[PDB]
Enzyme design. Structure first.
Site, PDB file in Angstrom:
ATOM      1  N   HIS A   1      26.709  47.481  19.220  1.00  0.00           N
ATOM      2  CA  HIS A   1      26.408  48.920  19.628  1.00  0.00           C
ATOM      3  C   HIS A   1      27.464  49.886  19.063  1.00  0.00           C
ATOM      4  O   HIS A   1      28.650  49.541  19.074  1.00  0.00           O
ATOM      5  CB  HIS A   1      26.305  49.071  21.104  1.00  0.00           C
ATOM      6  CG  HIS A   1      25.139  48.426  21.813  1.00  0.00           C
ATOM      7  ND1 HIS A   1      23.901  49.178  21.829  1.00  0.00           N
ATOM      8  CD2 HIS A   1      25.238  47.113  22.520  1.00  0.00           C
ATOM      9  CE1 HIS A   1      23.186  48.144  22.520  1.00  0.00           C
ATOM     10  NE2 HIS A   1      23.653  47.027  22.662  1.00  0.00           N
TER      11      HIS A   1
ATOM     12  N   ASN B   1      28.851  43.674  20.888  1.00  0.00           N
ATOM     13  CA  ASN B   1      27.514  43.557  21.019  1.00  0.00           C
ATOM     14  C   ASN B   1      26.743  44.386  19.973  1.00  0.00           C
ATOM     15  O   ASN B   1      25.444  44.447  20.383  1.00  0.00           O
ATOM     16  CB  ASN B   1      27.240  44.064  22.569  1.00  0.00           C
ATOM     17  CG  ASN B   1      27.950  43.412  23.723  1.00  0.00           C
ATOM     18  OD1 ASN B   1      28.798  44.007  24.494  1.00  0.00           O
ATOM     19  ND2 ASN B   1      27.828  42.131  23.757  1.00  0.00           N
TER      20      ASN B   1
ATOM     21  N   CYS C   1      23.573  56.237  19.268  1.00  0.00           N
ATOM     22  CA  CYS C   1      23.320  56.234  17.775  1.00  0.00           C
ATOM     23  C   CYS C   1      22.990  54.682  17.468  1.00  0.00           C
ATOM     24  O   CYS C   1      23.719  53.898  17.708  1.00  0.00           O
ATOM     25  CB  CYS C   1      24.269  56.857  17.057  1.00  0.00           C
ATOM     26  SG  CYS C   1      24.018  56.680  15.172  1.00  0.00           S
TER      27      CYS C   1
END
Ligand code: CHB
Ligand code: CHB
Lengths: 263, 265
Positions: free
Chosen positions: A187, A185, A222
């Protein structure tokens, strides 16, 4: 791997790989954390999923708020490790995933873990908190009586972590995620933060001690374009206080503690 | 995994993991490269090693990768089982070769293939040396006698000469540093880390519209834990081709050079 007879937990065996081990020829904590995520993903697949049907409808996702790992014995390269995992409702505040790590040959507990997960909107990143509709949906896949990996009244997994004060004793500056550090995804995956915390641990502690406990709080994610500073201060066995923050403005992303035993 | 009936090659099956896949829901090239080294290490263990021979351990000599060449026709999806077959081959006094064949365990079709050149080097002085006879006799008993090439073709990509990228580079990724997770059990930077470092300078638009088909990498010098790397890329071309250079951030000392071929999705 497979669901246990009652269908309330999931077990998987893993052969430790040559590239998964560290300097002492045993599985790193980054490898263990990947195996915990892998056995968790497989448990979710075997029960019909990690989002439910009405979670997809509201664009809601489960996000990790806390991770707590305790390792008594790291598996060596070539050993077979058995991991058992289960979920549990924790009221409308969220959900819990727990793990038990065992030596497949001796049947002995070599490690254990717990994690707190809360609900947030994928788009606005706002905590919506659990609703009754999204509770009966996965309550049918959780044990009804409490099953805790860390049962003890007031254990390490529920301890309040304070904020590290400047100046930090040790630091690792300019940490940046690469494409290998992202999931499907895009991330930054949770294991990356564990490695980032451990980057500021001095090499002398890594060579004379083994990591026994790690508790990590997740405050903010982050991004691919973000830069991280890793900060550590000794607070003591050897114990450390950890802080991960954005290189620029100093926005907190994580806080944690590590406990290390002499070899 | 296990050695095949004749004992001249080794096969292992691997279930693709949730964290091993990329944005496309298929195994990354960094995951494939880890699986190739894992099946290679297991082949060495099954034939009495711990890469180094009895004569190599006596002389403080090790095998080091000089070149890696990977070609992927179809990346395995998350949950699929991949079968990898690997074998070694002597190349006279120059060094050894390790080859791989990747297959879909269900259909039996070839989904990828790889080759690698390895040379002998003194562990301490880092000086390359040709293979002696006492060493060559010890490993020839575990290698097929007739040539068995993963890339047989008369004009194959695995033997192509790679030129040096010229400044200015079209694309770049500056300040790449190895972390403790990027090191092996001997504290050396893992070969797979260089592949990821090369691919860092590929622009996100090529990653989103193309899939990596071919990657050839030359290893000139190893990066230390205290070293910083700059990744450089220039397009050299329906298919997209790039020229790659990895060098030390400071002095500009070359560590790697390579090429990547990408096909449209
Ligand atoms: O090789 C090791 O012991 C090792 C690997 C990773 C890491 O996080 C640390 Cl602190 C040590
Ligand atoms: O997720 C991806 O598509 C991905 C992962 C690693 C990598 O190096 C590249 Cl170029 C792409």
């Amino acid at each position: 791997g497979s669901l246990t007879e009652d269908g309330l937990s999931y077990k998987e065996k893993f052969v430790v790989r040559s590239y998964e081990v560290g300097s002492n020829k045993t599985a790193t904590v980054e490898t263990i954390a990947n195996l915990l995520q892998e056995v968790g993903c497989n448990h979710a697949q075997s029960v019909g999923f990690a989002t439910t049907t009405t979670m997809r409808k509201l664009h809601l996702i489960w996000v990790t708020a806390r991770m707590h790992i305790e390792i008594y014995k790291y598996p060596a390269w070539g050993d077979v490790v058995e991991i058992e995992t289960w979920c549990q409702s924790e009221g409308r505040i969220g959900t819990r995933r727990d793990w038990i790590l065992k030596d497949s040959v001796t049947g002995e507990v070599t490690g254990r873990a717990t994690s707190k997960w809360v609900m947030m909107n994928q788009d606005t990143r706002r905590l919506q908190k659990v609703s009754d509709d999204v509770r009966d949906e996965y309550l049918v896949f959780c044990p009804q009586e409490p099953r805790l990996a860390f049962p003890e009244e007031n254990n390490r997994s529920l301890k309040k972590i304070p904020k590290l004060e400047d100046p930090a004793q040790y630091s690792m500056i300019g940490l940046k995620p690469r494409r290998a550090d992202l999931d499907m995804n895009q991330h930054v995956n949770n294991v990356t933060y564990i490695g980032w915390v451990l980057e500021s641990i001095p090499q002398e502690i890594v060579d004379t001690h083994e990591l026994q406990v790690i508790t990590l709080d997740y405050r903010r994610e982050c991004q691919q374009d973000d830069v991280v500073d890793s900060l550590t201060t000794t607070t003591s066995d050897s114990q450390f206080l950890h802080l991960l923050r954005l290189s620029g403005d100093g926005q907190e992303i994580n806080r944690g503690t590590t406990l290390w035993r002499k070899k």
